RNA sequence: CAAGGAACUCUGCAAAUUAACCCCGUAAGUUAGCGAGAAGGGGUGCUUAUGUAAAAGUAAGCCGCAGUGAAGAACGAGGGG
RNA sequence: AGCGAAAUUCCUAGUCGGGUAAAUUCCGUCCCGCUUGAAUGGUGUAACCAUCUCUUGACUGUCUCGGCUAUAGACUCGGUG
RNA sequence: ACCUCGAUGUCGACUCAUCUCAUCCUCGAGCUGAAGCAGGUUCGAAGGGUUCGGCUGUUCGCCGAUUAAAGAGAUACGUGAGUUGGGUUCAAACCGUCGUGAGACAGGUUGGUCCCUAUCUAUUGUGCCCGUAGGAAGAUUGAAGAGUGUUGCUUCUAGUACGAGAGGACCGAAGCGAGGACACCUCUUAUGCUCCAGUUGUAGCGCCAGCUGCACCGCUGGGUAGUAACGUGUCUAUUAGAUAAACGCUGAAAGCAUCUAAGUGUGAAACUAUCUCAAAGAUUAAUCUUCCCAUUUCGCAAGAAAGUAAGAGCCGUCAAAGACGAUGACGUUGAUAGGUUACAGGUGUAAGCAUAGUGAUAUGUUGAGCUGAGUAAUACUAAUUGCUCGAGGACU
């Protein structure tokens, strides 16, 4: 499982590289990540022509997952990386292109912005 | 670990009490001579009417 | 704590169950602990069980387990067995040996057992 | 008296699919999906080759690989599931009933099919 | 309060597709219909419950005093006898069936001893941290921990009663709530339940009302597709 | 042995990772010798043919998921005293 | 002269800047240096470090978070003890 | 400095916690220069829990992410006959200082040996003997008990009330949750040392093919059950009594007023219950059902005779159990274990043959082949035609 302090690429316009988590938002000694949790990020490599600064703390919702959960159809859909995308502020994300499909487990949480600007949903 | 004083005999007698032996199990047999074990062959090699060895 | 007796082990236990079979099938009877008696028999049986059927890649499955015996050897075992033994036992559904326990044994007191079989 | 557990299997006779086709691992299929969303059903065609095929009975799973805009999916699937519907599209050859090599290979290494 | 309850026992493990649009475990128990061997009422027996038999037997077996009290009373030769508390609504020696008593929605609670695993260590058995490995291991680093807090003649001097220890783990009837029916084998006397059942194969297990609550149904429906081609 | 990689910890103490062969390539510093196996990249299976005295090699074909298929195989870089 | 919050600075976890999301330890720099100090040498200084430290890449069972398997032990029976 | 200097191994950290309440949140109440929201004061309340990182031997301290909330002390600033030795101050080396000097720092810096097989008590499971008034097989209630009952987000209620504007409820309902705990292995993970596939070399099977041993299970990849979760499912709840703080009615003494004095109540995550678990060694030894014998009867109840027939025990097969004991099942009349048979499941086209090729190889045979533990019919084999104790309702 993904976990504090681990670097993984974005996918959205941003201009970063990697970026790591510092915490996972909600209630205390969770410390175990799943998908559609909101966490703070950190950047670790990003260029000046996007839109991010080195050493800036926001906060990011993972999409895809290298461990992979099982949903409630019964039918358990996996992926070989994990790939975040960071939000500002609220339930609207701060990039416009997204790169990659994404899944349909948090359709019913709202999101709605983040699935029109993505190509196909699971 | 030393103890903090020798234990007494009265005592030993109470560590030896549970560690009594019991006997064990005989049979005639019913085909060789003299008694022996349950379950088990005869000094006359065999089991019960089960002539299977010699038995010297 | 640390460099001692390598320990029992499942190569070790095989190879032992193998030389036992071996000699058994070489005399007949064999007389052991009965804890390698009660598993050295299955093994028997299931080796009776294919040798029930005479054919060479039978007989190339059953040398993975036959070894060297001064009484028998390997090639002189088969044909001892497959002439004699094997038609005996061809016409009963299993359980080709008989197991019958021995006293203590007189070096360790362990309730041997011995091996027996072919009526 | 006795338990013979096929009343394990005679419990969930009235589950079995209908046409429960057969196939093995290494045969690209493409399994349509039911999206039923109470405001419309959507059909969603995945396609991709086996990874595995485990059996006992009623929970006969299956993995399916897609590799879309560069990114690898893999989703177990059982043909027991309703709203599942699997059609077969092409069957190769493999010397296994097992692959984890695929599961982490790229473009061009995919098997071809035999007549 | 009345509480109807049956005995079975945990013959298999499986799952199944369900409405809502999601897969579900079921575990499977073979459940005895009953023969009601006594009653006792809350104005002699100074409470109400329900003793019956289970686990049928042969006539050979079940000693002659057993023998003769059930044939006394002409009852079925059972290896099992058990009570159920808060239960008189019936007569004697009746044939009862689960249907009767539970329903497709209905939580239930079940008793059922658990898997022994004689000794178990208190980490195994408590669920604590395993002892730091880096810049030594240390000699032991799987352990019960620490129960030193008594320095001198007046802060412990002893240790106290019941304090958490390995040993004997599990093998006891636990109880567990809110188990949904799933379904039942009128032909073959079985039931399919929601949730896990404690225990080995074939376990004993009793099943009775929730606790939680008096048992209210819900619209607990199995889902099934055909496709054809 | 699934994931994260130092977060645990005085501190990557440890452990773990690299590795043998040849084919490319190899930074700064500088007392010119070293650095340096620097670093980092390519491959080593089988069959046939060509290869020279032998190999190393080259060409073609073939298989496995992975081919010094097992055992003997340096972790590295930058900075300070 | 040189060097200096240094194996030397109590005040001091001193000031600033850099890395560090977040660093009293790290680096450069400031020199009122209680009491730096020139052969018990002073400043830079290459190769070398089973010397110490900081940071980073891979690596992970050190860590969230433990689980699984085989022996030797433990235990059980014998002998000795 | 009064036990201890003929013995308390000591600080921080890890694991393990515990106690109390001068109470941090969750709970409630009173009041407020508190319109609501955001507040403050005081009290009751200990039921529960109250973080992870950077600096540092360090508590503290500072910063960041926070979190519903990051309480205050003590249990020898708990925890070494549980762990490390991480700081000092054995010795060794070095810097500045002090002294003329060996040396010292009431300075710092570098690397710098952690013993104990448990006798009792206490604990956890575990058993043997006996008792409970003849004995056995069972079912039970339960006097005292033990477990835990934590909390956040979203939506509706509802922008209603409120204020004017900004903003924004009390109470209630539903869903999603987090921490912890219980159980299981249908899925999914992790393994899977008598499962299989491949693969290298060696030494062998008189040689090839094909096999075995060795090389960590030789290696790599899977995989039956098994075990644990990173997986599922559930639990946290509901209700009632007495109540705390607090809110009252009537109502006096004290013609008034008055929650108090009598009577009457309302009222909390606190107590008792409800739920989970154990049980009559509960010696205060309780209740109930059945069966065995009671074949006059000498003796303080059957040995002047039958000395249970009920059962229990020794032994074997054993595994749902299990450190060993025990628990539970079966002993020829038996399915207890194994074998046979077949099934499930796994590996995934055996060996061998023929064809094409110069040959590795590929094709048909071939879903063949085999498969430790799982599944059931099966007396085929092993559980002997074996043995020991054990009856007279005690007395009133």
Redesign the pocket.
């Given at each position: 499982?993904?976990?504090?302090?681990?670097?993984?690429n974005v996918a959205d316009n941003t201009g970063a590289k990697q970026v790591?988590?510092?915490?996972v938002?909600?209630?205390?000694?969770?410390?175990?990540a799943?998908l559609g949790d909101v966490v703070?990020v950190?950047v670790?490599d990003a260029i000046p022509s996007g839109m991010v600064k080195?050493?800036?703390?926001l906060?990011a919702v993972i999409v895809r997952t290298?461990?992979?959960?099982?949903r409630?159809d019964?039918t358990?859909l996996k992926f070989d990386d994990?790939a975040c995308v960071l939000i500002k502020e609220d339930k609207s994300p701060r990039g416009t292109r997204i790169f990659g499909p994404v899944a349909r487990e948090l359709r019913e949480?709202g999101y709605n912005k983040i699935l029109s600007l993505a190509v196909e949903v699971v | 670990?030393?103890?903090?004083?020798r234990?007494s005999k009265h005592?030993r007698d109470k560590?030896r009490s549970?560690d009594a032996?019991?006997?064990?199990?005989?049979?005639?047999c019913?085909?060789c001579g003299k008694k022996?074990?349950?379950?088990?062959?005869?000094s006359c090699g065999m089991?019960?009417?089960?002539r299977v060895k010699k038995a010297y | 704590?640390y460099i001692?007796?390598?320990?029992?082990?499942?190569?070790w236990?095989?190879?032992?169950?193998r030389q036992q079979v071996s000699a058994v099938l070489a005399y007949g009877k064999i007389e052991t602990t009965?804890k390698k008696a009660?598993?050295?028999?299955?093994?028997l049986?299931?080796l009776?069980?294919?040798a029930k059927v005479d054919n060479?890649?039978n007989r190339?499955?059953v040398?993975?387990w036959l070894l060297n015996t001064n009484l028998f050897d390997?090639?002189q075992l088969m044909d001892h067995l497959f002439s004699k033994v094997a038609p005996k036992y061809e016409k009963?559904?299993?359980?080709?040996?008989?197991?019958?326990?021995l006293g203590?044994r007189r070096?360790?007191?362990?309730?041997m057992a011995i091996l027996q079989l072919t009526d | 008296k006795?338990?013979?557990?096929?009343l394990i299997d005679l419990v969930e006779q009235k589950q079995l699919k209908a046409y429960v086709p057969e196939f093995?691992?290494g045969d690209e299929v493409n399994v349509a999906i039911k999206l039923k969303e109470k405001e419309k059903v959507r059909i969603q065609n995945f396609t991709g080759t086996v990874l595995?095929?485990?059996?006992?009975?009623?929970?006969?799973?299956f993995?399916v690989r897609k590799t879309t805009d560069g990114i690898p999916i893999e989703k177990?699937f059982?043909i027991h599931n309703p709203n599942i519907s699997i059609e077969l599209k092409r069957r190769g050859?493999?010397?296994?009933?097992?692959?984890?090599?695929?599961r982490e290979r790229s473009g061009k290494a995919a098997k071809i099919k035999?007549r | 309060m009345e509480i109807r309850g049956i005995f079975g026992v945990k013959v298999?493990?499986?799952?199944v597709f369900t409405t809502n649009n999601?897969?579900?475990?079921?575990?499977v128990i073979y459940c005895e219909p009953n023969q009601v061997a006594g009653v006792?009422t809350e104005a002699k027996?100074?409470?109400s419950?329900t003793?019956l038999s289970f686990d049928t037997?042969?006539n050979?077996?079940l000693?002659?005093?057993?023998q003769?009290?059930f044939e006394?009373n002409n009852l079925k030769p059972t290896?099992?006898?058990?009570?159920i508390?808060n239960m008189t609504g019936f007569e004697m020696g009746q044939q009862i069936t689960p249907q009767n008593l539970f329903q497709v929605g209905e939580?239930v609670?079940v008793?059922?001893?658990?898997?022994?695993?004689?000794?178990?260590g208190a980490?195994?058995?408590?669920?604590?941290?395993?002892?730091?490995?880096?810049?030594?291991?240390?000699?032991?680093?799987?352990?019960?921990?620490?129960?030193?807090?008594?320095?001198?003649?007046?802060?412990?001097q002893?240790?106290?009663?019941?304090?958490?220890?390995?040993?004997?783990?599990?093998?006891?009837?636990?109880?567990?709530?809110?188990?949904?029916i799933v379904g039942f084998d009128e032909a073959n006397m079985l039931v399919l339940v929601?949730?896990?059942?404690?225990?080995?194969?074939?376990?004993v297990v009793l099943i009775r009302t929730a606790?939680?609550?008096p048992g209210v149904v819900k619209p607990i429906e199995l889902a099934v597709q055909t496709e054809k081609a």
């Open positions: 499982m993904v976990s504090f302090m681990t670097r993984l790591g988590i510092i915490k938002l909600g209630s205390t000694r969770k410390r175990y799943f703070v950190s670790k080195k050493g800036q703390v906060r290298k461990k992979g959960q099982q409630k019964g358990h994990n949480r | 670990a030393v103890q903090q004083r234990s005592r560590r549970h032996l019991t006997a064990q199990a005989l049979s005639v019913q085909k022996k074990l349950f379950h088990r062959v005869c089991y019960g009417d089960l | 704590s001692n007796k390598p320990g029992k082990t499942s190569a236990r095989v190879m032992t169950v009965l009660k598993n050295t028999q299955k093994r049986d299931k009776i069980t294919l060479f890649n190339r499955q040398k993975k390997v090639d009963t559904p299993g359980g080709y040996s008989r197991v019958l326990k203590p070096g360790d007191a362990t309730e | 006795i338990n013979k557990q096929a093995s691992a595995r095929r485990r059996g006992k009975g009623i929970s006969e799973t993995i177990n059982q050859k493999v010397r296994r009933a097992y692959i984890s090599y695929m035999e | 298999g493990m499986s799952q999601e897969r579900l475990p079921i575990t006792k027996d100074k409470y419950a003793l037997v042969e050979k077996k000693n002659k005093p057993q003769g009290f006394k290896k099992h006898l058990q009570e508390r939580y609670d008793s059922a001893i658990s898997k022994g695993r004689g000794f178990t980490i195994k058995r408590w669920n604590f941290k395993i002892g730091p490995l880096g810049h030594g291991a240390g000699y032991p680093h799987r352990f019960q921990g620490s129960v030193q807090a008594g320095r001198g003649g007046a802060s412990a002893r240790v106290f009663k019941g304090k958490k220890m390995s040993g004997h783990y599990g093998h006891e009837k636990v109880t567990v709530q809110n188990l949904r929601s949730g896990a059942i404690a225990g080995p194969e074939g376990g606790k939680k609550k």
